[PDB]
Design a protein around this ligand. Sequence first.
Ligand SMILES: *[C@@H]1O[C@H](CO)[C@@H](O[C@@H]2O[C@H](CO)[C@@H](O[C@@H]3O[C@H](CO)[C@@H](O)[C@H](O[C@H]4O[C@H](CO)[C@@H](O)[C@H](O)[C@@H]4O)[C@@H]3O)[C@H](O)[C@H]2NC(C)=O)[C@H](O)[C@H]1NC(C)=O
Ligand SMILES: *[C@@H]1O[C@H](CO)[C@@H](O)[C@H](O)[C@H]1NC(C)=O
Ligand SMILES: *[C@@H]1O[C@H](CO)[C@@H](O)[C@H](O)[C@H]1NC(C)=O
Lengths: 49, 97, 49, 48, 97, 114, 49
Amino acid sequence: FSVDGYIRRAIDCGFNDLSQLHCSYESFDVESGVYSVSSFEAKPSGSVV
Amino acid sequence: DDCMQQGPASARDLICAQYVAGYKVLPPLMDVNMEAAYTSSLLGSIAGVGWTAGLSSFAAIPFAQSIFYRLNGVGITQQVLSENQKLIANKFNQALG
Amino acid sequence: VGWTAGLSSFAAIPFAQSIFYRLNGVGITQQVLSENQKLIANKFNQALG
Amino acid sequence: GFQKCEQLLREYGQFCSKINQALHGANLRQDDSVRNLFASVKSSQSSP
Amino acid sequence: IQRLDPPEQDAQIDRLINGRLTTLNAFVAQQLVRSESAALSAQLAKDKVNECVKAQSKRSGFCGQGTHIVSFVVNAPNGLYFMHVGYYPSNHIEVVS
Amino acid sequence: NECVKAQSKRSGFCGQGTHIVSFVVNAPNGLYFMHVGYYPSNHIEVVSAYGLCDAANPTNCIAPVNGYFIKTEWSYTGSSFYAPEPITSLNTKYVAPQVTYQNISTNLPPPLLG
Amino acid sequence: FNHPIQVDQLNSSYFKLSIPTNFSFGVTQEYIQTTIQKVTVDCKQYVCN
Ligand SMILES: *[C@@H]1O[C@H](CO)[C@@H](O[C@@H]2O[C@H](CO)[C@@H](O[C@@H]3O[C@H](CO)[C@@H](O)[C@H](O[C@H]4O[C@H](CO)[C@@H](O)[C@H](O)[C@@H]4O)[C@@H]3O)[C@H](O)[C@H]2NC(C)=O)[C@H](O)[C@H]1NC(C)=O
Ligand SMILES: *[C@@H]1O[C@H](CO)[C@@H](O)[C@H](O)[C@H]1NC(C)=O
Ligand SMILES: *[C@@H]1O[C@H](CO)[C@@H](O)[C@H](O)[C@H]1NC(C)=O
């Protein structure tokens, strides 16, 4: 949010792992490093009943 | 039993609270006489341990003799220590007394 | 490394020679170390073995 | 000592096992600390 | 239990459980912090006995203040009480060297 | 730095007994130190001097270096191992005279034969 | 209580020396932990699955 309140820039926090990093620090600029982020989930391919 | 036949010593007695609250204070690893034995044997080792090279031999020398070597070792000459042995002992005694 | 003054020079000397200087430095005389070099090495070896 | 409580306590897992083990270890630590400390104060040779 | 039926009785007992579980977790966390601290401290005591008591120290400020001469040790309620005797200079004068 | 890269003179810092040499290997969550110390045994009691003075020349006195002057007349032994050897200039230092030094008048060691 | 060797003081200008006649080498073993296992947690997955 800019001083005048408009949104000029944003991060989609679920787009990729880099985006998740920015969101977790609530910043567009984070320091260099190696960070753990949410795992890449396995998803169901079907169901058994 | 003390906490039953006499009861709590005062308000907020945390020793008697043990049997009520559900907690227990455990005894230490060594009793008092054993700990005293360790520091007593330590006292008797001081003059003869901090004396020369190596940790293997013991010089059973007077405490006073040890003090004079300790003072000489920090820069007080032997002529001074010899003239002032009673003065030094008195100052030492004042410091501890 | 544990041989003389300063941390800047390195004396590439035998381990055994180092041990004898280390023993001399704690109060065992050179006459003793010289007479007992094999005894000393054997005791050392027993300690590690 | 209330059974209803104990029944509900069980749904929190082995809570009390954790409390006891944590303190047991913490208590052993002092016996080891003391044993080591005194082993080092101990003299080899000493005068009476 | 005496006042409430199970669907509400449960909620009330559960509040007491949560509070007590919290208390015990806090207690344990502190016993672990305090025992870790005491253990580090015990190693400091170990070093002082060896550096201070069994030897004359040349390390300024390690033992007591001033120049170290001799230290003594007695037991204390939860540890050791060190008695460090140092040499304290006074009435300094200036000379040319 | 104290143990492995140097011989330590700090009692109890490294291992027990008098430190000689230490080695290091890795361990699962850290280092494993291997401290080799010197452990004395079979101690005996002997009678020692604080120092020796020439009885004829009372200001000329010696003290032992890293050892002791023992009766056996007087001889020198290293502090960690009893093994009497002659008193020589290599195991003595000249010192100021003291009341506790012995006055020797016969078998004077070479540093006092002046 | 394991008593230390008792060495008497003398009423004289001399002193008693308790001195070794024998020796051995021994090894004090010591372990120093320098690290702990490094762990990260996917907190969102842990809590909500
Ligand atoms: C080996 O020989 C030495 C040298 O003779 C001998 O040590 C000397 O012993 C005498 C006493 O037998 C000391 O002389 C005095 O002893 C009294 C004892 O109370 C002191 O009070 C005296 O001090 C006063 O006088 C001094 C004179 O200058 C003053 O300076 C001082 O401030 C006091 O006023 C005095 O010490 C003598 O000093 C010592 N010598 C040394 C170097 O200390 C030694 O004992 C003999 N060895 C053995 C084992 O007998
Ligand atoms: C022996 O010890 C006593 C203890 O008071 C002392 O007064 C006396 O002078 C001592 N004798 C010698 C030879 O040191
Ligand atoms: C030193 O102790 C060992 C222990 O067995 C013994 O075998 C050896 O003979 C001893 N040496 C002396 C000089 O007593």
